[PDB]
Amino acid sequence: SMHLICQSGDVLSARYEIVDTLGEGAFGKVVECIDHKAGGRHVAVKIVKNVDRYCEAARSEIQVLEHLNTTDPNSTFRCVQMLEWFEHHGHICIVFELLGLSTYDFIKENGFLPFRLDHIRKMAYQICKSVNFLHSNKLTHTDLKPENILFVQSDYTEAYNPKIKRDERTLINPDIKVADFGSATYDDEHHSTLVSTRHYRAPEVILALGWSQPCDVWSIGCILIEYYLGFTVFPTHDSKEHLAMMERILGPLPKHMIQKTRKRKYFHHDRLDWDEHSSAGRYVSRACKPLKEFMLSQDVEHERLFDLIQKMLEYDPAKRITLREALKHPFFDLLKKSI
């Protein structure tokens, strides 16, 4: 399938000439192309793996992007713009505007160093604005992560930082768009039990208590921590271990969530079925600690970021801050000071 249809100099749909690879995943591959029928404009083309699950996701993504791009033709709310779609050797191919590196790939190529706070503020504001627009449209993204947040243009300057003894890349312009609408779900359509990538998954999702727009707010909180530290505070590939890290970082789960959950496999009576002295138990207590102990400074702007993160990681999904409320949080006041 994929390896065999996607090399430099291939022309797709009689107009798109491949010149470079932008990204690969289990989903397929994104290539950079010259569009010979739009005056040589460069575009991105996603070539989707010919596998039921990713075929079904691509067809759902095309329907979501047609709606979102028509509703917001000026891209005021910063969703990726889809130009068209076609089929190539029976693979679904989606054409987009050409953007820059994903926030994940930038962090990777910067030796997993974090962003400076001023970029995190601008990036956080734009992400909340974009995903609030989806929420206004009775949609939930469900899979927000640093790989799905794209820079518009990833040009950088580089200098030695003697503070950390590391060469460091800084963006010229940190402006972002949101991508990857393949899992996005309307209020009135069927809700899968399993949504989100492990490290960004909300507690109501893990405990199968029903989910909606607030599971996107949890994901965004986890994204801001990774932007701030350069690593996840949930380094795990196990549902119960994840819950144990949550309790160490954020405090005990609310009693009403433990007693409603059908996920009895995680629990012994009314508490997590957890051995603090096992291999996983030792790891969790070495690797995890109270959230505010991860702060790198006590400056007020650091306190303002950590107050927003704490609100976004409220366990109860009704109590949890909405993105409409988040855009008014004091961390963003610096962005709104007169021009």
Binding site for ATP, residues?
22-30, 46
**Residue from the set 16, 33, 35, 46 that interacts with ligand EAE by CB under 6 A:** 46
**Residue from the set 79, 80, 92, 93 that interacts with ligand EAE by CB under 6 A:** 80
Q: Using CA atoms, how far apart are residues 8 and 61, in angstroms rounded to an integer?
A: 26
Q: Name the strand (E) or helix (H) holding 291.
A: none
Taking CA atoms, 77 is separated from 9, 68, 176, 274, 333, in Å, by 35, 10, 10, 43, 20
Angle at 54 between CA 226 and CA 131, to 5 degrees: 40
Shortest separation between residue 273's beta carbon and ligand EAE, angstroms: 36
- Find the residue with minimal CB distance to ligand EAE: 23
Taking CA atoms, 89 is separated from 83, 318, 334, in Å, by 20, 47, 51
323 binds ligand EAE (CB under 6 A): no
**Residue 272, strand partner residues:** 267
CA 280 to chain centre: 26
The region of 20-28, 227-235, 241-249, 286-294 touching ligand EAE under the rule CB under 6 A is: 20-28
Nearest C-alpha neighbor of 101 from the set 193, 20, 27, 18: 20
Shortest separation between residue 44's beta carbon and ligand EAE, angstroms: 3
State the CB neighbour count (10 A cutoff) for residue 73.
8
Q: Which is nearer to ligand EAE, 115 or 151 (CB)?
A: 151
Catalytic annotation, pick one of 52, 72, 105, 143 = 143
Is 143 noted as a catalytic residue in this protein?
A: yes
**For the window 138-177, what string marks contact with ligand EAE as x by the rule CB under 6 A?**
------------x---------------------------
DSSP state of 14: T
**For the window 99-128, what string marks contact with ligand EAE as x by the rule CB under 6 A?**
x--x--------------------------
Active site residues: 143
Q: Which residues bind ligand EAE (CB under 6 A)?
A: 22-23, 27, 30, 44, 46, 80, 96, 98-99, 102, 150, 179-180
